[PDB]
């Protein structure tokens, strides 16, 4: 009955910034790792980078991302952030949030409403 909503996409050159956001919506002690995936049009869901929603939680990000993604939280805003830097034509793909849940005791990602789409390419070039 909660989903996540991420947003704050848009279109960005290479080597641009963009910081994507989503509120902790239904954050409680047993759903608190919140996961993010990006799925670029025409392929498939790939897991970007995870925050463990508690004090001294851990930060995990994909080998793609590593080093140029960071993401964060505000407990006072409740709110998640995923501060992407150097980014890459690659990087283009929707974004969303997602709750971790235990079901059939395996770790799912649940809980995903509105992704929010990210482009990132050169503007200034043309060819007709």
């Known amino acids: 009955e909660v989903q996540l909503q991420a947003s704050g996409g848009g279109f960005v050159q290479p080597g641009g910034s963009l910081r994507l956001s989503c509120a902790a919506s239904?954050?409680?002690?047993?759903?608190?790792?919140m996961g993010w995936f990006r799925q670029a049009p025409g392929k498939e869901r790939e897991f970007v980078s995870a925050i463990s929603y508690e004090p001294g939680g851990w930060h995990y990000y994909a080998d793609s991302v590593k080093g140029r993604f960071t993401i964060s939280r505000d407990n006072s805003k409740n709110t998640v952030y995923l501060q992407m830097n150097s980014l890459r034509a690659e990087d283009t793909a929707t974004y969303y949030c997602?709750?971790?849940?235990?079901?059939?005791?395996?770790?799912?990602?649940?809980?995903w409403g509105q992704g929010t789409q990210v482009t990132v390419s050169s503007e200034n070039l043309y060819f007709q």
């Open positions: 997602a709750w971790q849940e235990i079901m059939y005791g395996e770790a799912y990602w649940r809980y």
């Open positions: 239904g954050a409680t002690s047993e759903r608190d790792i």
